[PDB]
Amino acid sequence: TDRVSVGNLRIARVLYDFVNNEALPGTDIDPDSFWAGVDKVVADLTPQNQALLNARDELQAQIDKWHRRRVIEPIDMDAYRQFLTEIGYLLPEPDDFTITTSGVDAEITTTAGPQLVVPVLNARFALNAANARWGSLYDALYGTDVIPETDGAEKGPTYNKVRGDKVIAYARKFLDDSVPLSSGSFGDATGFTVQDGQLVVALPDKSTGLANPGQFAGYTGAAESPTSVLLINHGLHIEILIDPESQVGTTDRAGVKDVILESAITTIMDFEDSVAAVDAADKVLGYRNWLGLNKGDLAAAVFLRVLNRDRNYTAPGGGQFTLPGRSLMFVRNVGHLMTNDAIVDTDGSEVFEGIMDALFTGLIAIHGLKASGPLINSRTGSIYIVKPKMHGPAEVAFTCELFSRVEDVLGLPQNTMKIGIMDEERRTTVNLKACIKAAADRVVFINTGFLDRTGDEIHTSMEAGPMVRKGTMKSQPWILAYEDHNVDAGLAAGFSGRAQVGKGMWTMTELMADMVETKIAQPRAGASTAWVPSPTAATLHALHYHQVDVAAVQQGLAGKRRATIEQLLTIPLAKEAWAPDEIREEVDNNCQSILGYVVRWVDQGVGASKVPDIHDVALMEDRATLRISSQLLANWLRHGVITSADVRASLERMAPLVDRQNAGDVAYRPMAPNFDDSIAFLAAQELILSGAQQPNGYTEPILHRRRREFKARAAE
Ligand SMILES: O=C(O)C(=O)CC(=O)c1c(F)cccc1F
Ligand SMILES: [Mg+2]
Ligand SMILES: [Mg+2]
């Protein structure tokens, strides 16, 4: 009695009102025509959506039976691959082709740099992420472990000048490495001037210019005493702020106050694995934040926080130009699996959620194409949607047809809605060229979502035998081939200069020294973007793109074929391998990370949490990391590595530790000692004990059911 009838649909009133009162005004779309289009698109495309999900089940059943029907020691790769071809899992590779996607912004086609992912249901996080286009290097260095807290350089309640001077020195070296002087070092600079459109750096006994004056991009203030100096390197901007009257500037030999880095070039506003949204009320919260971002007027509490305006500069010659102040925004829709009762049909059947996301996030994104102040997002006229968890090229073609039909409902030009393709399921990996071809006129990135991909690896081969420990997965042959294969397919499809080639998330949110040391591997592998968990991590990962010329790396990689199908298909089976203490560590680690994530998901609707692991390393958890942990334990239980008593005792042992870590939140409900009274604890148990039975190992069916159950209990 809380719904609105439109054709065969029954729409939750909160969603109907949100769309009519907030999303539609200003788009010139007729409300009656919009809702008729929703009815028609749902009716027309739901059968194919269901057909595709049934096809996954039929293929996995055949693969399950194949492994159970054999006894031979190692996979006979020739027989295995021929079988995958017969059942239509491995499809033929199409001829070479070049993508044709047009109307894409420079941040995607050309600029190499970090890409930030943030939960769209958290307005203050989403605001900080959009504002992360520019970030302080001094803050990122001083506040993290990139500068070690050795004797004398420790962080305290007040500024430590010994630490501050290490920060300054680190940044001066970065400047020398990125925008080198004709002679001397930035460490010895005493001042900056702009004379006849050229930057002049004062040294103690002479003056000098840049080795490449073309890296001088502009300044603020008067040319003869600028307030800042703007530089560019590998397409990314660097700004030296000059203020001798500041706390840090007073100590600096040139009065430098900070070094600002262009950081999160693009940001993915996430409706998928980092949020918990199980009904119309939840979906409206997310849609309204996405609306505020595109209209430019989102403002969050704690005083209030707003979106940054663009940045004004004087060109080296003399004109006034402007640089984007905000990250270019993508939105990650949900994939093809789930339904959501935000809309039900006349029989009470829930509507597919990915279909709804395309309609509603596409509608809302129109506001980002028009004046807010200037328009917020795409100046070239595109809407950028990340589509996750697709399995193979028919599922990509379906997304493209869904987008085409939504463009018609919205009165948008065909191919306005672009697609960032996650390569995060095995049947996409091994058919990647065909997947890109299916979206050849819409694709704006491919990205190795390696954590979902690991979950799919385990589930697909669940019946083959026990898998290696999850920490071993990152170095197994299949995943190394998968990473190279993805780059190869992108470059061969003409992505250089046209679309992003992306790699995955750094999850250790406090291990920033390790990130700076290690994550450089991604641009060295030819990735023009990769995922960071925070604005601070975006600023630090920006350093890697100044050190690595990704454009040159991609040109050197052109034409290579560095992964075979046999390599891609190498299942991560454990050899005949573990002492009891290693098995116990794996179980306790997986149970602790499952419980820490799931308890905040089910009881508080939080879809991404920092959860310390068994080694007290803080990890950003979302559904993909949960998918790995629950599938690994399900696999170990399936093949006798551990018993059902092992699992239960581990969960009961780790649950009170998770309770302790959450003891300060008035909204937290402890799981122990009354485990069977905690919907959250039972959800975590169900994710393991029923994991082998979930479709492709997905965690949403259980999580959504258990969160809805919790909401009902809290309302009675
Ligand atoms: O690798 C994949 O499948 C992803 O898609 C990555 C992802 O959501 C994510 C994650 F796993 C941990 C933290 C933050 C995130 F955004
Ligand atoms: Mg994923
Ligand atoms: Mg260079």
Ligand SMILES: [Mg+2]
């Ligand atoms: Mg199954």
